[PDB]
Amino acid sequence: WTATSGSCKGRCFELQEVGPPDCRCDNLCKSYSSCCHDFDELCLKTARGWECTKDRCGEVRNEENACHCSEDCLSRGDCCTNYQVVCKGESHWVDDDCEEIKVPECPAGFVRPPLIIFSVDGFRASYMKKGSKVMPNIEKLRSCGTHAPYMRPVYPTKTFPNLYTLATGLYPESHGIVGNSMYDPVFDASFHLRGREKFNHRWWGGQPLWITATKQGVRAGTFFWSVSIPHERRILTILQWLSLPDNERPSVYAFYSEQPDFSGHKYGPFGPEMTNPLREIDKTVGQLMDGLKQLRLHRCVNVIFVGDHGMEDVTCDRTEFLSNYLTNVDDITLVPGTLGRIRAKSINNSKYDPKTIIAALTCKKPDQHFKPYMKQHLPKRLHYANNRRIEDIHLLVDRRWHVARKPLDVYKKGKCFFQGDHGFDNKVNSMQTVFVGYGPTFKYRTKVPPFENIELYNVMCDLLGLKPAPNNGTHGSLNHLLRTNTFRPTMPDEVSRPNYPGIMYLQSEFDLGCTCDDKVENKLEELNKRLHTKGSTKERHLLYGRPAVLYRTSYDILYHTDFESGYSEIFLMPLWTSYTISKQAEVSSIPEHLTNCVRPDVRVSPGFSQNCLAYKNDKQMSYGFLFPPYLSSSPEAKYDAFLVTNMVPMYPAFKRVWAYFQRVLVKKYASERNGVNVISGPIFDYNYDGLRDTEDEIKQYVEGSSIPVPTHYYSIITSCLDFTQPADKCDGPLSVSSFILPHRPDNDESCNSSEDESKWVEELMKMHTARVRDIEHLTGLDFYRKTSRSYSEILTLKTYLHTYESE
Ligand SMILES: *[C@@H]1O[C@H](CO)[C@@H](O[C@@H]2O[C@H](CO)[C@@H](O[C@@H]3O[C@H](CO[C@H]4O[C@H](CO)[C@@H](O)[C@H](O[C@H]5O[C@H](CO)[C@@H](O)[C@H](O)[C@@H]5O[C@H]5O[C@H](CO)[C@@H](O)[C@H](O)[C@@H]5O)[C@@H]4O)[C@@H](O)[C@H](O[C@H]4O[C@H](CO)[C@@H](O)[C@H](O)[C@@H]4O[C@H]4O[C@H](CO)[C@@H](O)[C@H](O)[C@@H]4O)[C@@H]3O)[C@H](O)[C@H]2NC(C)=O)[C@H](O)[C@H]1NC(C)=O
Ligand SMILES: O=C(Cc1ccc(Cl)c(Cl)c1)N1CCc2ncnc(Cc3ccc(F)cc3)c2C1
Numbered sequence: 141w142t143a144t145s146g147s148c149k150g151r152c153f154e155l156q157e158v159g160p161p162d163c164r165c166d167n168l169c170k171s172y173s174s175c176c177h178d179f180d181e182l183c184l185k186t187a188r189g190w191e192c193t194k195d196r197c198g199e200v201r202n203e204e205n206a207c208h209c210s211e212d213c214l215s216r217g218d219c220c221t222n223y224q225v226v227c228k229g230e231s232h233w234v235d236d237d238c239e240e241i242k243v244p245e246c247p248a249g250f251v252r253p254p255l256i257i258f259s260v261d262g263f264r265a266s267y268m269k270k271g272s273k274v275m276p277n278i279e280k281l282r283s284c285g286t287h288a289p290y291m292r293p294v295y296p297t298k299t300f301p302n303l304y305t306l307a308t309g310l311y312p313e314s315h316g317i318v319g320n321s322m323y324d325p326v327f328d329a330s331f332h333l334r335g336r337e338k339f340n341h342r343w344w345g346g347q348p349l350w351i352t353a354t355k356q357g358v359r360a361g362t363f364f365w366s367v368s369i370p371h372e373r374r375i376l377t378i379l380q381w382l383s384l385p386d387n388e389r390p391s392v393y394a395f396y397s398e399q400p401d402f403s404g405h406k407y408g409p410f411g412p413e414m415t416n417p418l419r420e421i422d423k424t425v426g427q428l429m430d431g432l433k434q435l436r437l438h439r440c441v442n443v444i445f446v447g448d449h450g451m452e453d454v455t456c457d458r459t460e461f462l463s464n465y466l467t468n469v470d471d472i473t474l475v476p477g478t479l480g481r482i483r484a485k486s487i488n489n490s491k492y493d494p495k496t497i498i499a500a501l502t503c504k505k506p507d508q509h510f511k512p513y514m515k516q517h518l519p520k521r522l523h524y525a526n527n528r529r530i531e532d533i534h535l536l537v538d539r540r541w542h543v544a545r546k547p548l549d550v551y552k553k554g555k556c557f558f559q560g561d562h563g564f565d566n567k568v569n570s571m572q573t574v575f576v577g578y579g580p581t582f583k584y585r586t587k588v589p590p591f592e593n594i595e596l597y598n599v600m601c602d603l604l605g606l607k608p609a610p611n612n613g614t615h616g617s618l619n620h621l622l623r624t625n626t627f628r629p630t631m632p633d634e635v636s637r638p639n640y641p642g643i644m645y646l647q648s649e650f651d652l653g654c655t656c657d658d659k660v661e662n663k664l665e666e667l668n669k670r671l672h673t674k675g676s677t678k679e680r681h682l683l684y685g686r687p688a689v690l691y692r693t694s695y696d697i698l699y700h701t702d703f704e705s706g707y708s709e710i711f712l713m714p715l716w717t718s719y720t721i722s723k724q725a726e727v728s729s730i731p732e733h734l735t736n737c738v739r740p741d742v743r744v745s746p747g748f749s750q751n752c753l754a755y756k757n758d759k760q761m762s763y764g765f766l767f768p769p770y771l772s773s774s775p776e777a778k779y780d781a782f783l784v785t786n787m788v789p790m791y792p793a794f795k796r797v798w799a800y801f802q803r804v805l806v807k808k809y810a811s812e813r814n815g816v817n818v819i820s821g822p823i824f825d826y827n828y829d830g831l832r833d834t835e836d837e838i839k840q841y842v843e844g845s846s847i848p849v850p851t852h853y854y855s856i857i858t859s860c861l862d863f864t865q866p867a868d869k870c871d872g873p874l875s876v877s878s879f880i881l882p883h884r885p886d887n888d889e890s891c892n893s894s895e896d897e898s899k900w901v902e903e904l905m906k907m908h909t910a911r912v913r914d915i916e917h918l919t920g921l922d923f924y925r926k927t928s929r930s931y932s933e934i935l936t937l938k939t940y941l942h943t944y945e946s947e
């Protein structure tokens with residue numbers, strides 16, 4: 141119930157939301173059908189449109205008008221945005237030359253530069269260049285301010301997850317808005333674009349910027365706008381709020397445009413009909429900036445122009461139907477479109493089996509345009525699993541395609557409406573969106589590399605003097621965007637110090653069931669091999685210092701000629717193995733006599749070692765090595781690679797991947813990058829939360845043993861950004877690529893896996909590309925502790941994702 145017979149007189153776009161049944165006058169009242177009876181008359185005035193003209197200049201104030209051209213409008217804060225231009229001979233903001241804003245130039249009583257977020261729905265990154273001729277205000281923001289060539293959204297690349305990620309700094313799995321449509325089985329409730337369940341606060345987790353601000357004494361404009369409030373009125377409302385007295389005036393504001401997404405769905409991302417909505421958005425930016433100029437705030441406010449996601453060409457004819465794969469299609473519920481999520485239609489159906497659904501969807505058609513996954517097997521870079529609102533079965537849809545349950549769903553929702561959609565994998569080029577920052581706190585005429593939208597919350601907090609709530613950004617990684625207000629983090633403190641074991645065990649103390657043909661025997665070289673075991677080559681193989689262990693554990697540093705490792709006494713294998721391969725390095729084979737060689741490590745007790753007999757008896761599990769024997773520096777150094785302390789558990793199907801990486805790809809990268817440093821290791825994430833598992837969370841061991849089975853294997857591959865310098869003698873910035881490969885007992889993910897590894901392994905690794913920060917979370921390790929570089933620069937490096945998309 142609403143008693144809509146209250147009034148909006150003096151309450152138009154009030155900031156505090158009043159409680160039912162009392163009627164409302166705020167920017168969401170329309171969405172709730174709760175506005176007071178006189179809201180349209182008083183708060184949505186339209187008379188005479190949005191622009192002054194010469195004949196209105198100095199008019200007598202008429203309070204029916206949408207905006208004002210009368211002499212008193214400036215002091216009232218309600219002039220049309222073109223008032224000074226039409227009536228006082230001033231220029232539009234866009235026609236003024238760019239001049240660096242070295243310091244805020246703010247009116248008396250401003251405590252801090254305000255922040256205005258200008259968010260555009262469906263604004264694909266390439267519109268900045270492709271539409272630049274019809275967007276002159278946006279182009280001035282972009283060229284005069286700080287911009288990225290693009291900004292990466294989160295997955296799924298849908299509106300609500302991405303706008304709420306912008307506001308929170310959180311992955312969708314953590315904030316809880318995991319799609320535009322959702323079912324929460326604990327609540328037994330559904331969230332939809334249409335309707336009323338989406339208003340309940342239990343959907344919306346984390347802490348959005350407006351709450352963060354309010355909690356710390358900073359006032360916030362409301363970030364949401366009911367669809368029927370015209371854009372011109374949204375802008376005039378912001379400008380009116382900016383004229384409030386100092387004690388009442390918000391410091392942070394957002395504008396939201398439904399364009400160009402709305403037209404992009406109908407016309408495609410580059411439809412000829414797209415020119416007009418891009419023009420109209422630019423006009424709106426112009427209104428804002430002209431309005432700020434009238435208030436003398438154009439060199440005071442920080443403005444962020446940001447999109448939520450891009451837009452791809454998608455049509456009804458590019459739809460895959462689950463009815464063409466599954467016999468039992470009426471036993472499932474599908475969340476359809478540009479991603480798929482499947483669950484049982486009835487929780488009472490005990491014949492529902494996800495294994496059989498996954499199998500019926502795997503590599504069935506030669507050009508199949510989606511791939512099924514248990515959510516825990518999705519690329520870790522997506523961070524899309526750890527929420528009960530994410531169904532166990534996920535379909536990753538190829539760009540340009542849709543998935544649906546049955547054909548009747550697509551023509552009874554038989555011709556086609558739409559030409560554009562989004563939601564795909566967030567590394568897809570067409571899903572990338574925009575970022576521009578303009579203002580005193582941003583840099584002048586500065587291009588920055590692409591970054592992820594999860595990082596902006598921290599920066600917006602920095603722009604407002606707020607302490608961010610706990611989030612998934614890496615605070616400091618965007619310091620290079622800012623003139624001032626940088627956040628200067630310290631490196632985390634190492635929690636566990638390593639042991640440095642010497643030779644403490646005799647060979648005969650080991651009963652590991654291992655054998656090695658190594659009984660093959662000099663004082664020149666004897667001292668020399670001892671030196672290697674004490675760390676004499678470590679400067680070459682450990683280039684950025686040893687990783688810091690950020691949790692409590694027992695581990696040993698093991699040195700060798702060709703590699704260094706941090707060996708866990710708890711997990712019976714390395715946490716990390718580091719080695720450098722020069723451009724000139726040669727690949728060799730595993731000699732015949734060493735094919736099955738595993739050697740006891742006399743620095744590590746039998747009790748903290750793996751054993752070969754476990755692998756013999758586990759018919760499912762084999763082993764591999766972290767430092768690859770193929771890249772040994774000499775026949776004698778090769779023996780080190782067969783130490784039991786370099787061994788890790790590997791399914792034979794995974795060994796195909798791993799061996800190709802080690803034998804072929806590492807050397808290829810060293811040739812292309814002028815040497816690489818590699819750090820490899822295991823990851824255990826059995827509860828798919830993106831964070832390192834403790835010992836008691838491990839669900840699988842090598843049969844009969846205490847040797848835990850990794851869920852994934854990582855590698856971090858670092859070289860010199862200036863590739864004329866070798867990786868091991870680099871004076872300047874670094875370049876990195878990394879992966880987190882799922883450790884799976886089949887290659888069902890790769891439909892072409894019966895072919896030679898040269899046709900499928902590298903494609904797999906690109907899909908599972910990762911940020912160093914992703915690996916940090918998953919291992920509790922902190923990398924790049926000892927470089928010549930600034931810590932902020934290193935944080936940027938750690939957040940880099942190598943995407944393997946072209947321009
Ligand atoms: C990205 O950044 C975020 C934010 O930093 C990281 O997420 C944090 O991760 C922490 C560890 O996983 C987690 O800490 C836990 O907090 C519990 C209290 O949580 C509530 O309060 C906080 C603070 O206000 C609030 O933010 C939480 O909000 C979540 O839950 C509500 C639903 O009620 C949602 O609205 C909201 O969207 C959010 O959901 C997300 O997080 C939860 C997990 O909290 C997931 O289940 C969801 O799927 C979703 O992803 C909460 O309202 C606290 O109780 C936990 O403590 C347990 O574990 C510790 C281990 O040290 C143990 O010592 C304790 O005993 C305790 O265990 C007991 O409970 C167990 C389970 O019932 C039981 O098994 C035991 O036997 C014990 O009885 C824990 O400390 C923190 O909440 C989240 N924060 C958020 C906002 O998500 C995230 O990790 C980052 N991601 C990456 C990849 O780095
Ligand atoms: O205003 C809207 C349309 C809208 C209208 C009425 C209702 Cl009843 C609802 Cl629910 C939505 N929307 C779109 C969805 C959305 N999802 C999450 N956050 C926001 C706010 C926001 C704005 C800018 C920004 F950079 C970050 C966040 C937004 C903003």
Ligand SMILES: [Ca+2]
Pocket residue numbers: 261262298299300401448449
């Ligand atoms: Ca959107």
Ligand SMILES: [Ca+2]
Pocket residue numbers: 824825826827828829830831832833
């Ligand atoms: Ca985990």
Ligand code: NA
Pocket residue numbers: 755756757758759760761762
């Ligand atoms: Na075996």
Ligand code: NA
Pocket residue numbers: 887888889890891892893894
């Ligand atoms: Na396969």
Ligand SMILES: [Zn+2]
Pocket residue numbers: 262299401402405562
């Ligand atoms: Zn859309």
